[PDB]
RNA sequence: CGCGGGGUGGAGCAGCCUGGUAGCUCGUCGGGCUCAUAACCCGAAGGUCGUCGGUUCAAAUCCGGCCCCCGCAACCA
RNA sequence: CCAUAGGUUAAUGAGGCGAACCGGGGGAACUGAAACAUCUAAGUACCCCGAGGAAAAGAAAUCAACCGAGAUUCCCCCAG
RNA sequence: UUGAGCCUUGAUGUGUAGGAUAGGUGGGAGGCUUUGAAGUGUGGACGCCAGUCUGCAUGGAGCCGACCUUGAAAUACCACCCUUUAAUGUUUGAUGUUCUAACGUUGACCCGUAAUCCGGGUUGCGGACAGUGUCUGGUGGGUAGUUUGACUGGGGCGGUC
């Protein structure tokens, strides 16, 4: 955190030699947030991979079952009248050759994509621009599904992203500094599962190590 | 690291060496130069040919202190006792005072009587 | 004898021993000091002889649960 | 050193939890004053109950409340002075009533001198500043009197 | 009795113990400074580095005898 | 000062003795190792303290082995 | 007051051509600086002479994005990672500072006591010293236990084993 007039007045509550109990650190996490609105927290997954080898490089995301807060804007690839009940369930946009003219330009006016198998025959023209944006739906992930209206409602829980370039550990946002530490543990469990499904082939030796959360002048504590 | 621009300097010239110091009024030596620093043997070290090439080697010894105004003190009989001062003036420095402080013999212990030939 | 009057610690039999094959006697002697305590039942100070491990007990337990029950018949203290 | 508090002390105390203190400070103050102990969390209720009878009996020899701690902030000055030796030195300590008194009322030596020193009475005849002793919770200084006028 | 070493220009002492390999000072025979000699300076002349076989790219050097020596010890009953 | 060290008076306990055994303390060398230090010899020898009719031990934060034991001491054995 | 280690934090970061010193890197429109940005250099380090920091001349709530256009990649706002290096912090040795309370008196005094010890009190002067202990690097024939080759019509050197 940056040293500022509104930050000095909380920096005076902590000592550079002192660590806190796990249950006191989850309050220090909110004390250290100087904004009048509740700030967000980023978490590190403890790994397990070579920091620069590409056959150990990780990139992906996973969609949460219930989420930690803010919703995502959802687009649905389907045909005919099947889209209207999906607009009622949680879609903001419909996948059409009219909208594909924006998608081929790299411009995604949406945050998550769900596809119906007979409309996936259109998405297979655009997979090369959806790919490098994490948006490409896939049957092994269950984002290719006929029940698209229920699946866009399932997407409003939001998603967590993970990737590296130069570090062996991966850092990512997971929610507000005021989120329940017992429910944080549950979403981190779902993240660690998706990270084992996203395990690269050459990930030799140790992989998933113990996970913690860190504060300034309090040190990391177990989740 | 700002320049001080004012201070003192001390000159010593014996029959065997010229030794020049840029000093502080508290009695500190800030930088020094010796005429034996030019590699010259014996009483060569007391001539202007040696003492005149110690002055800018002494101004180099205070290159981070920064000098401009100097009050000079001079001792000893050695011929180099003023060429080292003019060479320092010619280095772009300005002499606030010159004073001679060469000792007058008092007690003197034992002299050569009995002097080497 | 260097007795810890507050616990009954005495010297003990024992050998020095080192990395040598020859073994020789030691007999462990205590370090021996004095300490002064207040007895709230007799409203006076008393001075007792104290030692390592023994002086660690009395400060931990408390004098009202050690010195206040230490007399076996009186011991003239 | 970790200790638990048995009485309300303005500088330190945690309810049902040990607090950090120096053992030397504790062994000169908080322990002999009955105000703290190392651990014994399981047994301090029986100790507190064993003091209840003792303080109920102590009220038979002294139950009085102090009235002097409320008065200290007037910074009231000494009216007694020592009679000085020809050389400008004093005879030192001999009795707690020929010193730091402001009311001349006592007929015998007092148990609590009006000022706190590690060694009683200073032999210097000059003006010096001493800490006024009422109770170990209210603090003041005063200069010594050398004139009595 | 031996033990360990040595075997060198004339004399006295280096080198050796790492074969690519005979040296310095005093001397001897002359040059330079000299009137002249010494010092100093520059030049020359010289040793079968014992003896016969062996081993080798080769032997003052290693290997076996013979042969002359130095030093240490040549009294214990 | 009060007090208490100190002083005095009354009472109890101990004191010395008695054969051998017995808990604790101090603690060898010889001997064997066909040689010696570790190891053996030995907690012996001798000395000291202290005490009972016996001393000492005990019914488990012990011992086993999935079977179970259920105090300790003494004896034959386990076992060369 | 500072030797040493360690935490903490800032400046970094460019070439080439163009506005433009994009360090890396993962997100990204309303969020942020008051112990702070400007000036742009006098002068100190570094230097692509621009710029930033030490600290001023000095002020003092902003600001920034569109159009324009570079590039794998962007220039508010917010994580994560770092070289070099100092100060604040911190652990831990020095140097010296005052002052009693572990400790001490082969100081003095009163009383036990017509007692050089001891005990109690009194009053001075020392001392975070000494004395001592757990563990331990080293020393130590002063003291003590022990080991310490053979053949040879003699021994020793030599030879033999």
């Amino acid at each position: 955190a940056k040293l500022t007039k509104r930050m000095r007045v909380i920096r005076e509550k902590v000592d550079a030699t002192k660590q806190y109990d796990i249950n006191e650190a989850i309050a220090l996490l909110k004390e250290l947030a100087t904004a009048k609105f509740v700030e967000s927290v980023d978490v590190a997954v403890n790994l397990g991979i070579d920091a620069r080898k590409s056959d150990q490089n990780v990139r992906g995301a996973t969609v949460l079952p219930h989420g930690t807060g803010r919703s995502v804007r959802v687009a649905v690839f389907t045909q005919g009248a099947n889209a209207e009940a999906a607009k009622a369930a949680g879609a903001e946009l419909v996948g059409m050759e009219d909208l594909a003219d924006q998608i081929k330009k790299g411009e995604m006016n949406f945050d998550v994509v769900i596809a119906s198998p007979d409309a996936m025959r259109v998405v297979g023209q655009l997979g090369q621009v959806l790919g490098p944006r994490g948006l490409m739906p896939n049957p092994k992930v269950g984002t290719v599904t006929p029940n698209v209206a229920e699946a866009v409602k399932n997407a409003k829980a939001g998603q967590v992203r993970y990737r590296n370039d130069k570090n062996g550990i991966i850092h990512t946002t997971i929610g507000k500094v005021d989120f329940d530490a017992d429910k944080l543990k549950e979403n981190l469990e779902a993240l660690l599962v998706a990270l084992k499904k996203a395990k690269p082939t050459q990930a030799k030796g140790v992989y998933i190590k113990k996970v913690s959360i860190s504060t300034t002048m309090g040190a990391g504590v177990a989740v | 690291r700002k320049q001080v621009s004012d201070g003192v300097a001390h000159i010593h010239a014996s029959f065997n060496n010229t030794i020049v110091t840029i000093t502080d009024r508290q009695g500190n030596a800030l930088g020094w130069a010796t005429a034996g620093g030019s590699g010259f043997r014996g009483s060569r070290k007391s001539t202007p040919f040696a003492a005149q090439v110690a002055a800018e080697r002494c101004a180099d010894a205070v290159k981070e202190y920064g000098i401009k105004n100097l009050e000079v003190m001079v001792k000893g009989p050695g011929p180099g006792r003023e060429s080292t001062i003019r060479a320092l003036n010619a280095a772009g420095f300005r002499i606030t005072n010159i004073t001679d402080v060469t000792p007058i013999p008092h007690n003197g212990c034992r002299p050569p009587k009995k002097r080497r030939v | 004898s260097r007795v810890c009057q507050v616990t009954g610690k005495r010297p003990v039999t024992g050998n020095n021993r080192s990395h040598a094959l020859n073994a020789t006697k030691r007999r462990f002697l205590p370090n021996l000091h004095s300490h002064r305590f207040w007895v709230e039942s007799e409203k006076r100070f008393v001075t007792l002889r104290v030692s390592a491990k023994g002086m660690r007990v009395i400060d931990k337990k408390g004098i009202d649960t050690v010195l206040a029950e230490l007399r076996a018949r009186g011991e003239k203290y | 050193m970790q200790v638990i508090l048995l009485d309300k002390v303005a500088n330190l105390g945690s309810l049902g939890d040990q607090v950090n203190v120096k053992a030397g400070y504790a062994r000169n103050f908080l322990v002999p004053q009955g105000k703290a102990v190392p651990a014994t969390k399981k047994n301090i209720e029986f100790f507190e109950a064993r003091r209840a009878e003792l303080e109920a009996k102590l009220a038979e020899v002294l139950a009085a409340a102090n009235a002097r701690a409320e008065k200290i902030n007037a910074l009231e000055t000494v009216t007694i002075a020592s009679k000085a030796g020809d050389e400008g030195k004093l005879f030192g300590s001999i009795g707690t009533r020929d010193i730091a008194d402001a009311v001349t009322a006592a007929g015998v030596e007092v148990a609590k001198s009006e000022v706190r020193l590690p060694n009683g009475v200073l032999r210097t005849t000059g003006e010096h500043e001493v800490s006024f002793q009422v109770h170990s919770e209210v603090f003041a200084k005063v200069i010594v009197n050398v004139v009595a006028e």
Side-chain angles (χ1 to χ4, degrees):
Chain A
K2 283 186 282 167
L3 182 61
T4 63
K5 194 170 189 169
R6 81 178 193 190
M7 183 276 193
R8 291 183 186 273
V9 292
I10 57 170
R11 183 267 172 286
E12 66 168 287
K13 308 185 186 184
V14 292
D15 193 286
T17 66
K18 178 177 173 77
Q19 297 184 347
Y20 297 92
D21 192 80
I22 316 179
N23 197 254
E24 290 166 33
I26 62 170
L28 180 62
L29 189 69
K30 186 176 180 183
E31 198 65 14
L32 291 171
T34 67
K36 298 177 195 178
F37 59 92
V38 184
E39 289 188 46
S40 304
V41 56
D42 300 74
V43 62
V45 291
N46 185 18
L47 292 176
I49 55 170
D50 186 301
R52 279 180 166 93
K53 287 279 155 61
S54 50
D55 67 340
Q56 302 191 42
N57 180 272
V58 174
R59 183 173 184 191
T62 187
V63 194
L64 298 177
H66 310 88
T68 63
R70 60 180 173 167
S71 296
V72 288
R73 204 179 201 237
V74 194
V76 64
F77 269 86
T78 192
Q79 287 174 95
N82 190 249
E84 181 185 75
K87 288 174 64 175
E92 284 75 50
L93 294 175
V94 187
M96 300 297 291
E97 185 180 312
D98 171 279
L99 184 62
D101 192 270
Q102 191 178 35
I103 296 174
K104 68 180 54 174
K105 300 175 169 64
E107 180 158 84
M108 309 295 180
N109 197 19
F110 49 85
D111 299 308
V112 174
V113 184
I114 303 297
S116 185
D118 199 57
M120 193 67 182
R121 299 193 291 104
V122 188
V123 184
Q125 298 187 14
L126 303 170
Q128 81 302 103
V129 293
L130 293 167
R133 296 180 177 79
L135 289 161
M136 187 60 175
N138 187 260
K140 172 72 85 175
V141 186
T143 50
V144 180
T145 177
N147 53 249
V148 297
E150 223 75 60
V152 300
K153 184 68 177 297
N154 193 29
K156 294 286 176 183
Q159 64 181 338
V160 294
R161 47 169 175 70
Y162 33 81
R163 61 189 287 195
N164 83 312
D165 192 87
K166 286 173 173 73
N167 194 347
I169 70 173
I170 293 169
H171 209 64
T172 198
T173 191
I174 193 162
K176 293 293 200 179
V177 299
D178 195 66
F179 197 70
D180 181 10
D182 181 71
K183 200 69 173 179
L184 182 63
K185 190 186 187 84
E186 190 182 307
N187 287 269
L188 189 59
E189 189 166 272
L191 199 171
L192 290 173
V193 171
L195 185 61
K196 289 179 288 186
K197 296 175 66 161
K199 181 179 172 186
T201 44
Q202 327 303 356
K204 295 184 174 190
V206 70
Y207 185 60
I208 308 305
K209 301 193 301 188
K210 183 71 177 178
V211 291
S212 297
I213 52 175
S214 293
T215 48
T216 295
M217 293 181 271
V221 297
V223 189
Chain B
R1 283 183 169 257
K2 274 179 166 64
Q3 297 193 40
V4 188
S5 309
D6 173 64
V8 278
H10 284 52
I11 310 297
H12 193 315
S14 74
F15 296 121
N16 279 358
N17 206 357
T18 314
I19 303 192
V20 299
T21 322
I22 296 169
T23 48
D24 188 70
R25 296 182 183 102
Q26 296 169 112
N28 285 356
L30 306 173
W32 64 259
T34 60
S38 301
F40 309 139
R41 288 167 176 274
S43 295
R44 292 184 180 78
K45 293 176 281 173
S46 304
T47 70
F49 189 85
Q52 194 166 342
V53 298
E56 292 164 271
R57 295 195 300 110
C58 203
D60 197 270
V62 298
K63 59 186 164 282
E64 301 188 319
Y65 202 95
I67 52 160
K68 185 55 52 175
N69 285 338
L70 292 172
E71 290 184 275
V72 183
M73 283 282 170
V74 190
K75 72 171 62 172
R81 76 196 314 287
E82 53 76 52
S83 51
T84 203
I85 307 177
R86 288 184 285 98
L88 190 66
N89 202 128
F93 311 114
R94 303 194 76 82
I95 303 170
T96 314
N97 179 260
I98 304 174
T99 289
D100 206 89
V101 74
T102 308
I104 297 167
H106 288 2
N107 186 264
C109 300
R110 210 181 201 259
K113 303 198 300 180
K114 204 68 168 178
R115 193 177 91 265
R116 294 292 190 271
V117 167
Chain C
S1 185
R2 294 179 182 196
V3 190
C4 188
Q5 292 173 353
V6 296
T7 63
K9 175 193 174 186
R10 287 182 177 91
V12 298
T13 313
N15 299 332
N16 175 9
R17 279 193 177 279
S18 65
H19 307 151
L21 271 58
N22 185 352
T24 44
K25 293 190 177 300
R26 177 179 175 164
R27 191 175 181 258
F28 286 80
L29 284 173
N31 60 90
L32 193 289
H33 317 286
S34 70
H35 209 89
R36 187 177 183 248
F37 304 94
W38 182 255
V39 182
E40 293 177 301
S41 47
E42 301 189 56
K43 302 189 183 184
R44 65 189 178 93
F45 292 102
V46 297
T47 321
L48 300 177
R49 289 179 158 205
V50 305
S51 187
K53 191 168 181 175
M55 192 58 194
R56 185 156 183 110
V57 184
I58 189 166
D59 186 274
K60 192 261 195 186
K61 287 187 180 182
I63 68 180
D64 193 61
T65 49
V66 178
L67 182 59
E69 63 187 76
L70 181 65
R71 296 182 190 283
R73 222 186 187 189
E75 295 77 66
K76 219 181 188 185
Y77 77 82
Chain D
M1 180 56 183
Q2 297 299 300
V3 299
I4 197 166
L5 275 284
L6 302 180
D7 185 35
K8 294 182 184 187
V9 180
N11 181 243
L12 78 179
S14 302
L15 292 171
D17 179 40
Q18 295 183 109
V19 299
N20 187 10
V21 73
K22 289 191 184 176
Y25 192 101
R27 204 175 68 181
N28 197 16
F29 308 113
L30 303 178
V31 178
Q33 292 174 310
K35 309 293 176 179
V37 289
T40 65
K41 184 185 173 74
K42 181 172 173 173
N43 198 5
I44 53 172
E45 287 171 277
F46 181 57
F47 184 35
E48 177 183 42
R50 192 166 67 251
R51 308 312 293 193
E53 303 186 275
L54 185 152
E55 281 181 34
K57 188 56 169 187
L58 191 62
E60 198 175 297
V61 291
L62 184 61
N66 190 264
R68 226 285 184 92
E70 193 182 63
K71 301 178 178 184
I72 194 174
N73 192 59
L75 308 180
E76 187 58 86
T77 73
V78 180
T79 68
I80 201 155
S82 306
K83 293 192 76 171
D86 194 273
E87 69 185 322
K89 288 184 177 175
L90 305 180
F91 62 81
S93 53
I94 193 57
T96 54
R97 184 174 65 114
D98 198 41
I99 57 173
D101 170 55
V103 295
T104 343
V108 294
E109 302 87 87
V110 300
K112 183 185 290 181
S113 299
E114 297 283 280
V115 293
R116 197 175 70 187
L117 292 171
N119 178 17
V121 192
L122 274 163
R123 297 184 181 245
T124 178
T125 60
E127 188 175 294
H128 70 88
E129 190 169 307
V130 287
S131 200
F132 195 77
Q133 182 174 232
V134 178
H135 276 268
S136 63
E137 64 193 69
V138 290
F139 309 95
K141 302 203 187 194
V142 70
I143 58 173
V144 296
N145 189 331
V146 301
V147 302
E149 302 196 311

